[PDB]
């Protein structure tokens, strides 16, 4: 239930920094709050739940959370 702002969790390979402690690299979008999540992806966590794995990963890549 870690809560963090949006573009600091955006990981850029240019910077190689700005990583928070004690977060799993695998799944970063869970820690985003619901209203920030709805800002970023324009869709609820439920219907994000039905989405396929490749489509979800493409959504991460678009939002630069991959």
């Amino acid at each position: 239930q870690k809560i963090y702002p949006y573009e600091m969790l955006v990981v850029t390979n240019k910077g190689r920094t700005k990583l928070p402690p004690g977060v799993d690299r695998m799944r970063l979008e869970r820690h985003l709050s619901a209203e920030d999540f709805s800002r970023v992806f324009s869709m609820s966590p439920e219907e994000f739940g039905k989405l396929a794995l490749w489509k979800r990963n493409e959504l991460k890549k678009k939002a630069s959370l991959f």
């Binding site: 990981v11 390979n13 240019k14 190689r16 690299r25 695998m26 991959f66």
Partner: protein, 373 residues
């Protein structure tokens, strides 16, 4: 009246040189010969036919670069003569006719290479004496132990030799033609997937630098592949001399994996770990336990991170689980062969092992087969 004998290591990629009895080589420079490929329009400047060494690397943008040695065998002899002359007169500043010289070569080679080296070095450079040694024996000398198995992988050739109590076994010597040049070519072939195009020799040098800086050996290949496909932690950014920034990503560990599985390059041969195991198992049954405990790595190709753990794990998987496997990789392994030369020419008895000019005048260039292992 002690004169320091010159020790010159002429590898496939880079050439090193120094004096006997020292700790580190004085001269280290790439063995690259460059030639111009464009039109010269400024009359007034000096004309230079060939660029040798680092001077070829500094102005590589207008040159075709050629290696005089590939796969451990030299082909263009004039370029090799230019490399030797630049080593003797510009990097060490010594008279070649005063000091003896010591050279290195691969274990299995065409027979004419030693004879041509001997003929060139007594005729063109007029040296008083010389000797030709095998790089793996010098690596074992620099390791400081009498017994062990030496796996030396340079820029052009890989070879494994076993030695027990100073007695080398010639029938268990294994030579494999896998080295860093094939890894660079494979990195060229796999960097096209991301959309980056590298085609000329300057691009070859850039790709070689990329491989040197941002490559590592995976401990588990399938685990690393799944992790790299699932997320984007394994990504690094390198910017070219032009200024464009490229991202490698997955290709960091796929290129070093060609050493362990040569099926990626199309070769049917076994990996380096199975090559070492087959070289060990070809020896006698009694001396295998000592060869497990004294495995020595050498060469710059074994400079990748995580190579020792993967080698130890693979050999432990191959070997029976009663004998205890130790891998010995010194941090300064890249120069270790040359360091062996600094011991070999410093021994008291080795002064009776030189190939004198008089014996050359008796027996032609074929004395090197009788006097060198």
């Amino acid at each position: 009246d002690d004169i320091a004998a010159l020790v010159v290591d002429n590898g496939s990629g880079m050439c090193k040189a120094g004096f006997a009895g020292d700790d580190a080589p004085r001269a280290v420079f790439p063995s690259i010969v460059g030639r111009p490929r464009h039109q010269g329009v400024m009359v007034g400047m000096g004309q230079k036919d060939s660029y040798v060494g680092d001077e070829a690397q500094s102005k590589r943008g207008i040159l075709t670069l050629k290696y005089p040695i590939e796969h451990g065998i030299v082909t263009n002899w004039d370029d090799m003569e230019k490399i030797w002359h630049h080593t003797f007169y510009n990097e060490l500043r010594v008279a070649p006719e005063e000091h003896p010289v010591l050279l290195t070569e691969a274990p299995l080679n065409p027979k004419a290479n030693r004879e041509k080296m001997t003929q060139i070095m007594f005729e063109t450079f007029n040296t008083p004496a010389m000797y030709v040694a095998i790089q793996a024996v010098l690596s074992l000398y620099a390791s400081g132990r009498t017994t062990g198995i030496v796996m030396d992988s340079g820029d052009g050739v890989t070879h494994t030799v076993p030695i027990y109590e100073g007695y080398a076994l010639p029938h268990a010597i294994l030579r494999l033609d896998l080295a860093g040049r094939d890894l660079t070519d494979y990195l060229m072939k796999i960097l096209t997937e991301r959309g980056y195009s590298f085609t000329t020799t300057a691009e070859r040098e850039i790709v070689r630098d990329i491989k040197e800086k941002l490559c590592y050996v995976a401990l588990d290949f399938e685990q690393e592949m799944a992790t790299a496909a699932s997320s984007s932690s394994l990504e690094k950014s390198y910017e070219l001399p032009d200024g464009q920034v490229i991202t490698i990503g997955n290709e960091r560990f796929r290129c070093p994996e060609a050493l362990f599985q040569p099926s990626f390059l199309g070769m049917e041969s076994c990996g380096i770990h199975e090559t070492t195991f087959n070289s060990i198992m070809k020896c006698d049954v009694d001396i295998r336990k000592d060869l497990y405990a004294n495995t020595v790595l050498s060469g710059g190709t074994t400079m990748y991170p995580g190579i020792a753990d993967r080698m130890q794990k693979e050999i432990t998987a191959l070997a029976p689980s009663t004998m205890k496997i130790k891998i010995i990789a010194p941090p300064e392994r890249k120069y270790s062969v040359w360091i062996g030369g600094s011991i070999l020419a410093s021994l008291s008895t080795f002064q009776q092992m030189w190939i004198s000019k008089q014996e050359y005048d008796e027996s032609g260039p074929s004395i090197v087969h009788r006097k060198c292992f």
